[PDB]
């Protein structure tokens, strides 16, 4: 279908990374044509690497992400050498906010800083955003799609969370909102929610126990629920985000209850089955009327209604189980298969620091 949330990449203007880095090499590097004027072609190499990571109208592929990741690893490796205190270091990175259009009354929202902390913050944001795009793009009724989407969602979650913990110490100023701890904390939870939904979807495909699927769905409802609560009083993220999180919260509760009801029927608890099915129907009716424009809930509602109609029919004419109230049923349990991937450099596949010997 279409309904996963992904993140648009921030834009930068191009900058000459080499030229300023060239002027610093004349240090414990004396004569011409040596490590001296080799490192300058590695600085020539790294400036070229920035334009590939950040300059190109992008590619939602293994290739483009790896470029970004490499560019992140490479910056991280370059700080403990150059502007460790910098009284001038003539080099300034400019980034547009990912979300804030600005106002067509006076242009976009941008922020220029002469800081490697700023730069790597925005790059990492973009590694996260491209990962969510690749993740969202994947075919979920195919097994390696499921795995690529769960891997990238957890990466993107871990990467957003790394910026939250790190943006402020990393920077000179109050950041743009897109990378400020609160937005990126929320983006972190969304990606983790989506990761878990992918693990629920995979469980449904591995045709696992309904008991385990209910717990995985219940866990997701919590991730989506927390996330939409973080968005309730705020209008930073694209406007589709909060309604998708709201629906996805009720959808996952409805999956939890539907699967738990199947278990209940297996155990001949026919009243419990109707109760849990009534709850699922209600959750889904709510999402259908309230969130029409964002999710398509029809097949799942029909599935629930047939099961409810058959349950009621046999119970009234055969079993006569008392249908319990919701508050009298045990909580459905919770299980997570999902974690925010720590950012430990190198995050790129076959990392070569172009300035290893320095």
Which technique was the structure solved with, according to the deposited record?
A: X-ray
**Cα separation of 204 and 295, whole Å?**
19
The distance in angstroms from the start CA to the end CA of the chain is 50
Find the Cα–Cα–Cα–Cα dihedral 53, 79, 36, 31, rounded to 10°.
150
Question: For the chain, give me the number of helices (H) and strands (E)?
Answer: 10, 2
**Cα separation of 212 and 218, whole Å?**
10
- Tell me the two tokens of residue 85: 């205190």
Instruction: Classify each residue of 106-137 as buried b or exposed e, where b means 16 or more C-beta atoms within 10 Å of its C-beta.
Output: eeebebebbbbbbbbbbbbbbbbbbbbbbbbe
Resolution in A: 2.5
**Cα separation of 358 and 354, whole Å?**
9
Structural element, H or E, at residue 281: helix 270-291
Quick one: DSSP state of residue 206? T
Residues 6 or more apart from 208 whose CB is under 8 A from it?
A: none
Hey, what domains does the chain have and what are their CATH numbers?
Answer: 1-358 (1.25.40.280)
Cβ proximity of 93 and 113 under 8 Å: yes
**Cα separation of 124 and 155, whole Å?**
11
**Cα separation of 298 and 282, whole Å?**
13
């Amino acid at each position: 279908m279409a309904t996963f949330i992904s993140v648009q990449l921030k834009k930068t203007s191009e900058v000459d990374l080499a030229k300023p880095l060239v002027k610093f090499i004349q240090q414990t590097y004396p004569s011409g044509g040596e490590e001296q004027a080799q490192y300058c072609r590695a600085a020539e190499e790294l400036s070229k690497l920035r334009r590939a990571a950040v300059g190109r109208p992008l590619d939602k592929h293994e290739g483009a992400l790896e470029t970004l990741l490499r560019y992140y690893d490479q910056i991280c490796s370059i700080e403990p050498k150059f502007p460790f205190s910098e009284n001038q270091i003539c080099l300034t990175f400019t980034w547009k906010d990912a979300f804030d259009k600005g106002s067509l009354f006076g242009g976009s929202v941008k922020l220029a800083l002469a800081s490697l902390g700023y730069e790597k913050s925005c790059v990492l944001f973009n590694c996260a955003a491209l990962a969510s795009q690749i993740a969202a793009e994947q075919n979920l009724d195919n097994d390696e799609g499921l795995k690529i989407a769960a891997k990238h969602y957890q990466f993107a979650s871990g990467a957003f969370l790394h910026i939250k913990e790190t943006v402020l110490s990393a920077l000179s100023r109050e950041p743009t909102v897109d990378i400020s701890p609160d937005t990126v904390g929320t983006l972190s939870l969304i990606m983790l929610a989506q990761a878990q939904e992918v693990f629920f979807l995979k469980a449904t495909r591995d045709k696992m126990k309904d008991a385990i699927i209910a717990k995985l769905a219940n866990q997701a409802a919590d991730y989506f629920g927390d996330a939409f609560k973080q968005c309730q009083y705020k209008d930073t993220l694209p406007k589709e985000v909060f309604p998708v999180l709201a629906a996805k919260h009720c959808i996952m509760q409805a999956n939890a209850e539907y699967h738990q009801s199947i278990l209940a029927k297996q155990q001949k608890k026919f009243g419990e089955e109707i109760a849990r099915l009534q709850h699922a129907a209600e959750l889904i009716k709510t999402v259908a009327s309230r969130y029409d424009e964002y999710v398509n809930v029809k097949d799942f509602s029909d599935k629930i209604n047939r099961a409810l109609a058959a349950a009621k029919k046999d119970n009234d004419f055969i079993y006569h189980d008392r249908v319990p109230d919701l508050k009298d049923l045990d909580p459905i349990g919770k299980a997570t298969l999902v974690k925010s991937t720590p950012v430990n450099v190198p995050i790129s596949q076959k990392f070569t620091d172009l300035f290893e010997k320095m």
